[PDB]
Symmetry: D2
Subunit: 260 residues, 4 copies
Amino acid sequence: SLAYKGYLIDLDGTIYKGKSRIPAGERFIERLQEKGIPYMLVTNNTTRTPESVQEMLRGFNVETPLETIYTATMATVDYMNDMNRGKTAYVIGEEGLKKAIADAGYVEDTKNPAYVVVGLDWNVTYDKLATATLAIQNGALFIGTNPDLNIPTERGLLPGAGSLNALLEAATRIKPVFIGKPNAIIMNKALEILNIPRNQAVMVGDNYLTDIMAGINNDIDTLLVTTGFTTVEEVPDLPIQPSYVLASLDEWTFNEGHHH
Amino acid sequence: SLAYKGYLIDLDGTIYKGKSRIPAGERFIERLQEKGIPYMLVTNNTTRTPESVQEMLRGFNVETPLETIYTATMATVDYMNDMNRGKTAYVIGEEGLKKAIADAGYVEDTKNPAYVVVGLDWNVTYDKLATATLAIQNGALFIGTNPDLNIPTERGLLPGAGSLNALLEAATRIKPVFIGKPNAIIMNKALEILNIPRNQAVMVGDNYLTDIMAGINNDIDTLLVTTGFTTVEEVPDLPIQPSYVLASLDEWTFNEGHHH
Amino acid sequence: SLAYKGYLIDLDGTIYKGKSRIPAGERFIERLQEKGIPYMLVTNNTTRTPESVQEMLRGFNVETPLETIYTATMATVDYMNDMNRGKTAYVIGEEGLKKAIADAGYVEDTKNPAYVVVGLDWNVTYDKLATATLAIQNGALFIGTNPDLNIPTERGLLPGAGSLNALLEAATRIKPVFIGKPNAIIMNKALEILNIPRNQAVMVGDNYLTDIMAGINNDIDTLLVTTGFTTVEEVPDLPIQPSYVLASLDEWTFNEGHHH
Amino acid sequence: SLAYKGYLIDLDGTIYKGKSRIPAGERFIERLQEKGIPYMLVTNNTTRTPESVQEMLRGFNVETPLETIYTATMATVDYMNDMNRGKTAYVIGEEGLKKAIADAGYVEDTKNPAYVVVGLDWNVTYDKLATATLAIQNGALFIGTNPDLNIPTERGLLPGAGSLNALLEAATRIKPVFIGKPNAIIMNKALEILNIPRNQAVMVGDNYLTDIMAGINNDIDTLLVTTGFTTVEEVPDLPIQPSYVLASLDEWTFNEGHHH
Ligand code: NA
Ligand code: NA
Ligand code: NA
Ligand code: NA
């Protein structure tokens, strides 16, 4: 009857919601901190530095150590460093991702790069896509930062990183190695930093396809909170139920545990 | 032992090859004309008017009546007119396609168009893709002009119309109605203009996935000539052999026929 | 303002429903007959001879000439005869399909058949699937009779012909040529027998994915009647609306027409 | 310049080949043992107990502790125990898999089982497939033991577990959680038993799509030995090269390491 010993937690839709608060999300982090329970904040977003995420969270009454924040950009860089294929890349994405990759020592090579890395680019163009296509055809290791097919905006549900990757997969017949949730690489790396065994951890989030499938596919218990992307109405028809479903994180006691 | 009574024929790779001649292709049309055998020239290209195709072919010693030329742009417009969903559209593509659609009376509606039509756009942008995504989500009838995943260029095999459509299918979960070869709509419409029964026609081309599958999927005999996209080396491993495989159209006698 | 000149019409779910009547379906055929309007009854079912369909329909007060009935089995045989690849086949399916193929002169070849043909087999086995896999790998022309993923039964929605084909596509990497609705081959052949131009015909049925997509994908107007597979509640969320949606075929006047 | 500290190693195609020896594979294990380097033998096969694998390996001059053997059956049971959805299952597979699941306390429930588990069944039938389909539709957690599309036999490349899963995915629209290589679950669990950090481990095998993609997708260095499924000729066209490619395991020194 041991309680969970560590937490992996989504941000947008869970701890805050766009520009709006989720006060129970703020209290969830507050309570983790008061109890001394380790956690990681795990996001597919590739546009912010961890410093920027940390500062943004202060506006929602969350003061979290820098080292608790783990983004798909960090995991992408970490994977590139591990695979050790060479310090050249061609990148499609926002400045945050491009700067992280360049800061890690990867220099732009538009023709024979070791890596082609593709995240959301709000200003993607045919020519960027053609450049990536040829580079992939020429043998670069093709990485997608995150598989999300859409990104919610004030305009509506626009194409996400996963849709841009879909164009290149169609054009090259090469499937990208996707780093972000629900895939293994970001989960393994976040678990490593958490330094708690997988069977003592819980993944907490609002998004069934990224957060909850992250737990199902990687064998980690799951807490779905219905404050974000996955609506209350959608829960009954989920093919695989999460370990827990909550309307508010205030319902969580921290006494919950695996097989407990 | 009746010879084929009509021909459906690809252009680039078959009658000419980019800026270069295929002299036996020119002689194939010459011989059709001398024998009085009806034919259509059927292309997935969406960037030229039939007038432009006709003029271009003169440079390769081919003088063909305007009415022999049938492009994926024409078939797209014809399909839109038939389906009669309304005279509004949002189009991704080159000027040739956009002008044809506007000339047909479709006015641009970026929000609630009856149709979203997607062909190759050498200058596609995130914002054009986002606009199409929302319009499709809002209920527009989503049409792809042609399914080709790539387009050959001097640079290499770049993303084609089919790859741009792939991004939108990923972002919307809606599969486009593809008009161009090897799909039925362009084939039915070309056959209609040809005015010869399907079982008395042959589809002639260089490209297995567009021309030869056009015949296999639509039940029309096929002549593969290995002067273009599908190489001589690839022929043995084709999953379904064409009705005929030729190294040069000069080998064709016009005495060939169905079950003959 | 010309009325439609010919009809293509689904059976189960439209003219009758399993063992139960749809009286307005019976009256639809009665009215067609009284008005002298040509029609075809077009079904993906591969288990009955057209004689058997004709006799069964008598129990639902429908007396229809034998030549009005066109099944996926007939269209499969017709396609095999047209493609003229040789009088050998390996077949997965029920006795009705196997007998039709043998009656057409195709002899069983388990190793090097010209054709592999796959429909629903209520008693499919690993060994039949392995036999078909090897035969396809060896170069046989792989045909699926109909693409339906499921078949409704008293037990529930069981795997259909399309699901059996899916196993073989996975095992061989070869996609079958699917004959049945909504694909072109059965539609072209039914239209040929109907002998009415495509733009003067309407496809009538209860099943969006087979009957209504048959019209959308092949450019034929569509009448969805909500007495069968596609429910009234599902209509608003259809990606492409049918030309007409009716709760009962009694609402149809026969004065309806294309662009009319 | 630290050498790898642990090994994950495929069996058939790597340590032996069907009924035939790979003597350098036997010497690879001998050398690991002499050097005291920990290893796991990781296989997608679901038909043998680890005792049976251990006995079989003795015939190839390999004496390995029982605890070094980790199969897709073990990992499937482990995952079912972890997910803790209930002690009922419906299983498609061979007796080895069925016995392991029953030994773990899962009782057969053909209607409302907590789990549906699908591996290769040499005698699969329509009725077993229909039973699984309904059980999945009814909400069971659908698990595929291993994703391999084919299984090599004396007859040829027959349908594998992944192809049987493909039928059920088509019939249900539910994708299985695949346990076996190259998926994360079997890799994480083997790594756990190995008790060596991921970045100090190497995955060794003959099969690009299962063993080498296991390393690429899960961020573990890879040794491809060309004695089995992936041929020497196929190596140049691999989309992502392994960390090492060897013609014989005799070329490996055990001085090789990560970034070393
Ligand atoms: Na979220
Ligand atoms: Na061509
Ligand atoms: Na029906
Ligand atoms: Na192997």
